[PDB]
């Protein structure tokens, strides 16, 4: 149901994320080193579909943020999990 209407699309993603004594903050890596990395290609149209999704979700997200008072919002996905459950078992 996603139609990518952008002038162009980078078909691939080069991504980063955050996933003995290494676990101890004192001995572990500095912040620049806590990230992992890798590539994904446009398998079955997923990457360009994803770029279009992010372009469409932007309006809803900005209106949401206008309404709230939290200086930093970390709870959008927790709310989604709760609504998911209420819709099925309310």
């Amino acid at each position: 149901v996603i139609v990518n209407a952008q002038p162009k699309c980078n078909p691939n993603l080069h991504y980063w994320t955050t996933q003995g004594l290494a676990w101890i903050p004192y001995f572990g890596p500095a912040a620049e080193g806590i990230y992992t990395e890798g590539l994904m290609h446009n398998q079955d149209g997923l990457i360009c579909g994803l770029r279009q999704l992010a372009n469409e979700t932007t309006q809803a997200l900005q209106l949401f943020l206008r309404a709230t008072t939290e200086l930093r919002t970390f709870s959008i996905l927790n709310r989604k999990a709760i609504d998911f459950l209420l819709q099925r078992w309310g």
């Binding site: 579909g49 979700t57 997200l61």
Partner: peptide, 20 residues
Amino acid sequence: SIPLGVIHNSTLQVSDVDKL
């Protein structure tokens, strides 16, 4: 009212709010 994408073994769909 923020949309979620859903990743299937088909393609990427946008989750509804009216359709479960």
